[PDB]
Amino acid sequence: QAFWIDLFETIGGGSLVPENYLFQGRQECYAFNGTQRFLERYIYNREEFVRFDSDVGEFRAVTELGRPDEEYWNSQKDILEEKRAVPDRMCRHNYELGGPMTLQRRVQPRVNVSPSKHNLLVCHVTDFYPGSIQVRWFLNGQEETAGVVSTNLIRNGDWTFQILVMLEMTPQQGDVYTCQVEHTSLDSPVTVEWKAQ
Amino acid sequence: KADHVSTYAAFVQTHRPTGEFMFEFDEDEMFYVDLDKKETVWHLEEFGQAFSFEAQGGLANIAILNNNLNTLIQRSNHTQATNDPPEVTVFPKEPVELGQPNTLICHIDKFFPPVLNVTWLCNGELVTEGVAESLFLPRTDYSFHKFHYLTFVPSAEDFYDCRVEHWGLDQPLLKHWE
Ligand SMILES: *[C@@H]1O[C@H](CO)[C@@H](O)[C@H](O)[C@H]1NC(C)=O
Ligand SMILES: *[C@@H]1O[C@H](CO)[C@@H](O)[C@H](O)[C@H]1NC(C)=O
Ligand SMILES: *[C@@H]1O[C@H](CO)[C@@H](O)[C@H](O)[C@H]1NC(C)=O
Ligand SMILES: [Ca+2]
């Protein structure tokens, strides 16, 4: 039930003594086929100057600014041993912990079919998770592949996505257009119809 | 190369917000340590009911990062980075239907530093209610992004604008969607 952190390393200033300065730190866990790779990044403003990579097993200077930090931190066998332990310690721990609510998170898409403001038919697929989604257009049961524009996958910033899929249509009376959405949160595909009239 | 990327991202600066400590799963913020109230804030109710994170772990990391900041201000001989202006986009959460509730999303992207002023305007009038915002989300390119939200009821007489002030912008960026 508890997420684990590891403390960032200290760059000592020593003892001797609009305007803006920024420092950014990142602890990145890359999960892949059971494996865990850990990267610890030290950034001054937009400049990553030093980093720990589990595939290297030590700190390496990204720019000349991080040369004192590579030299110093690598001479501390205690720092190296705790960083090397991260993939199996926090990376693996947090990934297993945050499993049912993250990788096993499945939120169903809401589908709306409406003609545009070359007549265009808009399939607005909204509020779903994960991002991977299949949207297919059909006219009287036959799939329409040409004249189809799929927007970029839109991240809402609230743990949901949205996508707009539009088709170039030439509608006759009685024509039935169908937007078919397939997603990991759905047992059977979702189908929304539009009658030309 | 990964199926999933879990990252703790923290920043510390001279201007407001002075610091930020957060955890993201696949570029989405799961939780953050509110530095002012000094407590863990979970993005979704479900994350809080299932998990826990001790606030002291964030606060301690901010302290370490602040020490590293001061050392680098000295080392870099007071190097201030160039102000990188944002790219703004306004889009609704749901397909628009006149009279039916919706959320307008203002997505401010590719900016540095994470210092910004964002206002919602309806017909040239400042809007204070129904407003919400995300944190300064750290991008993999060491730039930032942010989300601003406005809950509204679509009206053909109501014109919404998202105004953003940033040091890299001489004039404020004014973006819209009906
Ligand atoms: C890891 O991935 C490789 C293919 O990239 C696969 O052959 C292997 O079975 C996977 N798991 C293990 C235990 O090596
Ligand atoms: C800071 O200035 C000194 C000269 O006084 C120079 O030797 C040093 O390399 C400078 N460092 C940076 C990062 O500009
Ligand atoms: C934000 O607004 C305040 C006044 O409310 C001002 O001091 C500051 O310079 C503004 N500009 C930016 C880009 O933050
Ligand atoms: Ca340490």
TrEMBL record, chain A:
Ranges for domain Ig-like: 109-191
Main location (coarse class): membrane
Gene Ontology annotations of biological process type: adaptive immune response; antigen processing and presentation of peptide or polysaccharide antigen via MHC class II
Location in the cell: Endosome membrane; Lysosome membrane
Swiss-Prot/TrEMBL keywords: Adaptive immunity, Disulfide bond, Endosome, Glycoprotein, Immunity, Lysosome, Membrane, MHC II, Signal, Transmembrane, Transmembrane helix
GO cellular component, one term: lysosomal membrane
Membrane association type: Single-pass type I membrane protein
Descriptive protein name: HLA class II histocompatibility antigen DP beta chain
Gene giving rise to this polypeptide: HLA-DPB1
Part of the whole protein covered: 33 to 218 of 258
